[PDB]
Design an enzyme around this catalytic site. Structure first.
Site, PDB file in Angstrom:
ATOM      1  N   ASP A 154     111.627  11.012 -51.735  1.00  0.00           N
ATOM      2  CA  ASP A 154     112.549  12.124 -51.911  1.00  0.00           C
ATOM      3  C   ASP A 154     112.563  13.230 -50.707  1.00  0.00           C
ATOM      4  O   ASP A 154     111.635  12.870 -49.887  1.00  0.00           O
ATOM      5  CB  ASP A 154     112.771  12.683 -53.359  1.00  0.00           C
ATOM      6  CG  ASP A 154     111.507  13.372 -53.550  1.00  0.00           C
ATOM      7  OD1 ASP A 154     110.763  14.230 -52.472  1.00  0.00           O
ATOM      8  OD2 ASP A 154     110.821  13.360 -54.694  1.00  0.00           O
ATOM      9  N   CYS A 164     108.909  14.613 -49.349  1.00  0.00           N
ATOM     10  CA  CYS A 164     107.735  13.712 -49.197  1.00  0.00           C
ATOM     11  C   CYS A 164     106.557  14.447 -48.156  1.00  0.00           C
ATOM     12  O   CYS A 164     105.547  14.458 -48.411  1.00  0.00           O
ATOM     13  CB  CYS A 164     108.259  12.505 -48.880  1.00  0.00           C
ATOM     14  SG  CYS A 164     108.827  12.413 -47.049  1.00  0.00           S
ATOM     15  N   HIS A 212      99.641   9.322 -32.612  1.00  0.00           N
ATOM     16  CA  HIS A 212      99.424  10.324 -33.594  1.00  0.00           C
ATOM     17  C   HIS A 212      99.604  11.618 -32.771  1.00  0.00           C
ATOM     18  O   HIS A 212      99.575  11.782 -31.674  1.00  0.00           O
ATOM     19  CB  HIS A 212      97.932  10.456 -34.109  1.00  0.00           C
ATOM     20  CG  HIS A 212      97.119  11.112 -33.455  1.00  0.00           C
ATOM     21  ND1 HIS A 212      96.218  10.266 -32.054  1.00  0.00           N
ATOM     22  CD2 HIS A 212      96.506  12.348 -33.022  1.00  0.00           C
ATOM     23  CE1 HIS A 212      95.252  10.932 -31.594  1.00  0.00           C
ATOM     24  NE2 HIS A 212      95.706  12.372 -31.870  1.00  0.00           N
ATOM     25  N   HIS A 242     109.664   8.863 -43.518  1.00  0.00           N
ATOM     26  CA  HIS A 242     108.813   9.057 -44.525  1.00  0.00           C
ATOM     27  C   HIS A 242     107.291   9.163 -44.400  1.00  0.00           C
ATOM     28  O   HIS A 242     106.699   8.341 -43.712  1.00  0.00           O
ATOM     29  CB  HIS A 242     108.954   7.758 -45.458  1.00  0.00           C
ATOM     30  CG  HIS A 242     108.320   7.948 -46.852  1.00  0.00           C
ATOM     31  ND1 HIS A 242     108.678   8.548 -47.866  1.00  0.00           N
ATOM     32  CD2 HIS A 242     106.877   7.113 -47.273  1.00  0.00           C
ATOM     33  CE1 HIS A 242     107.606   8.590 -48.805  1.00  0.00           C
ATOM     34  NE2 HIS A 242     106.930   7.726 -48.754  1.00  0.00           N
TER      35      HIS A 242
END
Lengths: 239, 150
Positions: A44, A47, A214, A232
């Site tokens: 949602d 997250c 990263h 996400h």
């Protein structure tokens, strides 16, 4: 749909891409060399905030780092103050501050409240605690962005066409409003906790030489590590 | 000509560019300097985001214009995709994704050729160049995958 999932091995990640892209299969192989497990978080709008919540509280649970707790409580006071200086009435955020501070102390062992991994899991898996803590983090984020409206304005105007104040009220503060890079820089600076975001997408500029890249947020390897796939966040556990 | 790109930690990246370069060329130069894959960047000028097939000229970007760099780090959003074989999969998405981007993600997970894909939601076929936000498709909706060859 559990707000935060059980620890799974990386094999479940790798099963999602097993029949698909070789770039992703390889990136996940490589991610396995550094990370044991993941915790899927519900996809949602919150997250990232939910991942952060649980990763940090689990860090304090596992580390018993009383000094980190003292330090972050100072940062939380200064945040309380900046939301005060910005016209926010206490009844609009201080309930969120109280819920989180109480979670933080409950994760410290020794006394009465003191909770273990399972009650922390059900607490962050229960709408009527998790949501309040998400909101706390959104208000700390809003405070930090408005405190620095001048630095963040050129990035926010291009992200949305909003003003910093607009942004804060429409994009940061409300439940469900998706977060982005500005949100993360703000929260990490505001609380002073570092974040490593592993970026898992199909990019591969150097054919046959694949790495997972990263991005570090650092106000000493980040003890919050999140998996990100365009759109996400889940939680990563290093070896 | 030089241009500058400011980053959300206050770094300033100096680039050598030509007015006719595309935004993708600039992102490639930024990747070389910083190690950020081009698909992960969002460049900004004058409150506007810069689109990949357009040039520095197109945005009036001249000598020593300052741009701004944000990383593509937006979340949360997952949607479901159910095939007609009862397999359901989850997809990581953003409201700005084109239906085309969505099909490329389905290929990422299931290897299904995007040319073969048709996505049904709410009784209609979803069109390649509209977005998930065009359809007001939010988290945990279920799109329905259907295949056609040629």
């Amino acid at each position: 749909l559990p707000y935060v999932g059980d620890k799974e091995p990386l094999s479940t990640l790798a099963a999602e891409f097993q029949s698909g892209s070789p770039i992703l299969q390889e990136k996940i192989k490589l991610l396995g060399e550094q990370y044991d497990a993941l915790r899927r978080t519900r996809g949602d709008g919150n997250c990232f905030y939910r991942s952060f919540m649980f990763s940090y509280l689990e860090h304090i649970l596992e580390t018993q780092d009383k000094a980190e707790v003292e330090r972050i409580l100072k940062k939380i006071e200064q945040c309380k103050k900046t939301l005060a200086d910005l016209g926010y009435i206490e009844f609009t955020f201080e309930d969120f501050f109280s819920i989180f501070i109480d979670q933080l102390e409950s994760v410290l062992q020794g006394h009465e409240s003191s909770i273990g991994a399972e009650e922390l899991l059900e607490r962050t898996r229960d709408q009527m605690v998790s949501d309040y803590v998400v909101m706390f983090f959104r208000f700390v984020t809003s405070g930090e962005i408005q405190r620095r409206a001048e630095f963040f304005e050129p990035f926010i105007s291009g992200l949305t066409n909003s003003t910093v104040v607009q942004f804060c009220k429409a994009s940061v503060e409300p439940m469900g409003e998706e977060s982005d890079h500005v949100h993360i820089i703000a929260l990490s600076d505001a609380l002073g906790v570092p974040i490593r975001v592993m970026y898992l997408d199909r990019s591969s500029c150097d054919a046959g030489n694949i790495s997972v890249n990263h991005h570090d947020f650092s106000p000493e390897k980040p003890y919050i590590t999140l998996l990100y796939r365009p759109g996400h966040y889940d939680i990563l556990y290093p070896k | 000509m030089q241009i500058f790109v400011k980053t959300l930690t206050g770094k300033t990246i100096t680039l050598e560019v030509e007015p006719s370069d595309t935004i993708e060329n600039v992102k490639a130069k930024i990747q070389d300097k910083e190690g950020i894959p081009p698909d992960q960047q969002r460049l900004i000028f004058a409150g506007k985001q810069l689109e990949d097939g357009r040039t520095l000229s197109d945005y009036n970007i001249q000598k020593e214009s300052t741009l701004h760099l944000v990383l593509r780090l937006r979340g949360x959003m997952q949607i479901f995709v159910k095939t007609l074989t009862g397999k359901t999969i989850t997809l990581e998405v953003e409201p700005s994704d084109t239906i085309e981007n969505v099909k490329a993600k389905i290929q990422d997970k299931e290897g299904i050729p995007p040319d073969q894909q048709r996505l049904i939601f709410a009784g209609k076929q979803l069109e390649d160049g509209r977005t998930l936000s065009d359809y007001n498709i939010q988290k945990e909706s279920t799109l329905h995958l259907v295949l056609r060859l040629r």
